[PDB]
Amino acid sequence: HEQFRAALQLVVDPGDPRSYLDNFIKIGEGSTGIVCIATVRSSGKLVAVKKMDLRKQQRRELLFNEVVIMRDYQHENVVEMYNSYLVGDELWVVMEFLEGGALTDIVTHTRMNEEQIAAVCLAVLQALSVLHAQGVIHRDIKSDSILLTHDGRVKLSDFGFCAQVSKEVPRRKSLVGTPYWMAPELISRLPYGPEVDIWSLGIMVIEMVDGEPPYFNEPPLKAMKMIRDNLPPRLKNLHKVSPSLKGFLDRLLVRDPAQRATAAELLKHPFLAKAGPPASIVPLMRQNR
Numbered sequence: 377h378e379q380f381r382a383a384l385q386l387v388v389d390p391g392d393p394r395s396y397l398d399n400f401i402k403i404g405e406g407s408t409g410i411v412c413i414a415t416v417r418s419s420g421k422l423v424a425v426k427k428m429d430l431r432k433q434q435r436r437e438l439l440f441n442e443v444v445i446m447r448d449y450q451h452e453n454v455v456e457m458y459n460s461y462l463v464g465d466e467l468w469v470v471m472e473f474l475e476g477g478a479l480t481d482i483v484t485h486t487r488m489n490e491e492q493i494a495a496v497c498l499a500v501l502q503a504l505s506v507l508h509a510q511g512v513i514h515r516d517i518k519s520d521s522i523l524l525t526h527d528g529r530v531k532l533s534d535f536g537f538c539a540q541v542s543k544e545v546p547r548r549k550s551l552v553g554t555p556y557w558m559a560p561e562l563i564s565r566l567p568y569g570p571e572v573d574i575w576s577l578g579i580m581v582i583e584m585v586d587g588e589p590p591y592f593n594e595p596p597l598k599a600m601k602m603i604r605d606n607l608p609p610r611l612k613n614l615h616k617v618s619p620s621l622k623g624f625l626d627r628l629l630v631r632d633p634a635q636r637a638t639a640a641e642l643l644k645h646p647f648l649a650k651a652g653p654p655a656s657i658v659p660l661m662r663q664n665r
């Protein structure tokens with residue numbers, strides 16, 4: 377720790393955000409710390425701040441990942457990092473604020489139609505081509521990780537559990553990600569590539585279609601056991617999805633990762649043609665219904 381704080385000091389911006397930020401508000405909680413929002417006194421713009429405790433982590437060297445990998449990264453479809461700091465015993469990551477909030481709130485309250493679902497998927501997949509291109513694996517994809525703007529635009533967040541691969545470190549080995557949405561290989565402790573993200577995406581479609589992931593009402597521990605062992609889960613209500621949507625999902629939920637489609641490929645699948653403008657998501661959002 378003594379040494380690990382010293383390292384993180386050298387990757388983050390020096391100084392204290394409290395100097396420029398006012399009026400902090402907890403708005404959330406992930407598995408590693410909390411999420412606040414805050415106002416920048418000059419200008420008055422809003423920012424989100426992720427705050428993680430250095431002493432309160434399982435596997436902290438993980439904490440290294442977003443700050444190192446995802447600094448200076450930019451995309452229409454990624455939530456932007458501004459800076460990062462250490463505040464006492466915490467890591468603070470200051471990020472772009474998203475008004476629309478999370479997709480979770482939508483999938484758990486309405487029935488996204490096909491057009492809308494495709495629009496989420498294209499947004500996610502655009503993002504994911506470029507990420508994997510660079511050998512970056514998000515490793516915690518799910519509706520939780522999808523954030524919206526006031527006008528319906530989709531951006532991917534929660535890179536706290538992301539990973540880097542290269543020519544020399546080709547695949548990864550650690551159990552991260554979130555259990556219901558984790559991939560078979562990853563559970564079975566295999567080396568894994570980006571392709572794990574693609575599986576997790578599929579589970580997101582089940583989220584979008586059936587309102588929650590497979591094996592949900594189970595204990596987390598047993599769900600993994602199940603996810604590992606059985607056949608690819610399919611929809612509770614099949615009769616409700618287009619053949620377009622099926623074939624597509626059937627490219628995502630593939631147990632053998634070498635045959636599971638690449639985002640690159642998925643960016644072309646006829647389904648996504650159905651996607652509709654950012655403004656077609658708008659009425660799904662809490663403050664409209």
Ligand SMILES: CC(C)c1nn(C)cc1-c1nc2ncc(Br)cc2[nH]1
Binds near residue numbers: 403404425471472
């Ligand atoms: C509680 C969360 C889902 C939320 N609600 N609303 C209205 C906005 C948000 C939210 N927007 C966010 N933008 C960036 C980060 Br990092 C976290 C964010 N959380």
